[PDB]
Structures are given as C-alpha cells and as structure tokens.
Amino acid sequence: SPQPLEQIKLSESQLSGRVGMIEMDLASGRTLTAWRADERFPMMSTFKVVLCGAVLARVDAGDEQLERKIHYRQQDLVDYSPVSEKHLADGMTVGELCAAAITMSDNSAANLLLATVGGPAGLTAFLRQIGDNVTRLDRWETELNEALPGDARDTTTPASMAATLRKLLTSQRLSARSQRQLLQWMVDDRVAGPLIRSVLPAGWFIADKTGAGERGARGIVALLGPNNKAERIVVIYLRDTPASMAERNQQIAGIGAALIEHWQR
Numbered sequence: 001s002p003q004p005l006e007q008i009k010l011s012e013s014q015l016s017g018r019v020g021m022i023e024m025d026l027a028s029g030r031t032l033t034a035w036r037a038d039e040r041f042p043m044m045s046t047f048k049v050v051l052c053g054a055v056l057a058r059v060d061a062g063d064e065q066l067e068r069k070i071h072y073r074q075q076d077l078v079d080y081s082p083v084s085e086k087h088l089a090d091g092m093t094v095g096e097l098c099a100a101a102i103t104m105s106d107n108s109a110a111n112l113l114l115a116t117v118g119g120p121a122g123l124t125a126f127l128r129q130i131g132d133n134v135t136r137l138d139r140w141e142t143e144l145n146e147a148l149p150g151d152a153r154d155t156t157t158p159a160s161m162a163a164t165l166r167k168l169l170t171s172q173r174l175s176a177r178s179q180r181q182l183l184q185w186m187v188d189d190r191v192a193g194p195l196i197r198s199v200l201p202a203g204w205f206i207a208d209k210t211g212a213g214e215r216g217a218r219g220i221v222a223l224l225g226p227n228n229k230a231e232r233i234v235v236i237y238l239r240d241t242p243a244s245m246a247e248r249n250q251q252i253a254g255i256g257a258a259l260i261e262h263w264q265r
C-alpha cells in the first residue's frame with residue numbers, strides 16, 4: 001500500500017531484523033529499488049538455482065549430461081530429502097536432482113549435485129569465473145543454513161544474487177535450451193510457487209526459489225511482472241529476527257504488495 005522503500009523500512013522495524021532487497025529490470029539490469037543491496041545475507045536453499053546453473057554450464061561444455069544417472073547410499077542422505085530418499089535403489093539423473101533441489105528443495109539432491117561441480121569451492125570458482133566476486137559457498141547441506149551472525153560463509157548480497165541470476169537467464173553464457181530449463185525449474189517450484197500464485201492478482205507471472213535458516217533467516221529470489229511476462233527480478237533476504245515464520249512470510253508478501261501497487265517507476 002505504501003511506497004515499496006517505505007514499506008521495506010516498516011517490515012525491518014516490525015521484524016526487529018535486517019532486510020536486504022533489490023528490484024532489478026531483467027532485460028537491461030537497471031536497479032529500480034534497493035535496500036541493504038550491498039550487505040551480506042545467508043543464501044540458504046536459494047543457492048540451488050545458481051548451483052543448477054553451473055550444472056547446465058557443464059552439460060553445455062559436454063562435461064555433464066542431464067540424463068546421467070547418479071547412484072547414492074542411504075548414508076549419503078541428510079535431513080529433508082522428500083524425493084531422493086525414494087530412489088536409493090534406482091538412483092536419479094542429474095536433471096532430476098536439479099528438479100528435486102529447486103522445486104521440492106531436497107537437501108540431499110543439492111549435495112549430490114554439489115559433488116559434480118567440485119564442492120562449494122568448485123561452485124564459488126564458477127561464480128568468480130562468471131563475474132560474481134562476492135557470493136561464496138563454503139559448506140554443504142545443511143551446515144550452510146546455520147546463519148551465524150557476522151559470518152560471511154555461504155552468503156551473498158541482494159545486488160550480487162540478482163546480477164548473477166540475470167547473467168544465467170539472459171547472457172549467452174548458457175545455451176538457449178539450458179536457460180529454458182533453469183527458468184522452467186523455477187516456475188515449477190512446488191514449495192511456495194502455487195501459494196504465491198494463489199494471492200497474486202490475475203495476469204502476474206511468477207517463478208521463484210525461496211530459503212529459510214536459523215535466527216529467522218528467510219529469503220526469496222523471484223521473476224515477477226504484469227501481462228503474464230517476467231519483467232523484473234526481485235531478491236529479498238531476512239536475517240537475525242525472532243519473528244514466527246508466518247509473520248516473516250507476511251512481511252515479504254507485504255513488500256511484494258507494495259511492488260505490485262506501485263509497479264510503474
């Protein structure tokens with residue numbers, strides 16, 4: 001209802017925590033709104049879209065195949081594996097692991113994919129090789145969600161995650177089918193996708209990947225826009241807040257309501 005920058009300030013003073021947000025134009029990369037855009041926030045399960053982006057880069061270089069089946073043991077599973085635990089005998093293909101990791105947020109799917117790109121260090125090197133010098137992955141699932149105050153491990157900044165997401169979905173760094181696949185995994189998120197579409201006004205496109213960690217950490221990376229087309233990239237991160245998940249979810253929907261009400265800017 002109020003201007004999106006003034007509403008983002010109300011959410012931080014009502015949550016008693018720090019909020020980081022950036023509204024960027026997908027086609028040109030111009031930043032429309034930014035609050036704590038250069039400040040670090042834990043990435044959480046949102047690093048999985050960037051992780052699958054490095055996976056499609058190896059398939060593009062002929063080093064990987066989304067059809068390759070990976071086999072794992074029960075000892076390789078970590079907390080929260082909704083689909084990978086159901087395939088300990090038949091295994092899952094690299095494409096299926098990226099789908100389970102982004103749409104269902106399976107934590108074991110992300111670790112299994114992490115081992116193919118050279119660990120969190122192999123993924124930070126791909127980020128630096130792609131132009132991102134701030135985002136860094138240090139641990140595996142689920143230690144990277146600890147959200148220790150003052151710790152730069154496994155973090156990013158809203159401005160960096162937005163610029164890397166735009167580079168992966170619009171630069172020629174990824175071939176057309178690969179870019180088409182990464183976007184499809186995001187509009188197919190079965191965790192918050194349908195819940196957000198349920199309260200979005202008609203004609204609004206949405207694709208996303210959210211996250212949640214300790215100390216009230218919560219984040220969302222999304223593609224939004226009127227006329228059923230993804231026009232902007234919005235990245236919002238929440239950290240160091242004792243508020244309930246419902247109020248943290250209601251604060252992010254409140255910033256999203258101010259963005260839709262004052263869209264033209």
Ligand SMILES: OC[C@H]1O[C@H](O[C@H]2[C@H](O)[C@@H](O)[C@H](OCCCCCCC3CCCCC3)O[C@@H]2CO)[C@H](O)[C@@H](O)[C@@H]1O
Nearest residue numbers: 196199200201222224234252253254255256257260261
């Ligand atoms: O005048 C514009 C519109 O205003 C309302 O739409 C509401 C809507 O009723 C509401 O459900 C939603 O909640 C916002 C839900 C937030 C979900 C977004 C979550 C993330 C997505 C990616 C990052 C940004 C926020 O806001 C709008 C705008 O006020 C009307 O219902 C609607 O008829 C109308 O088209």
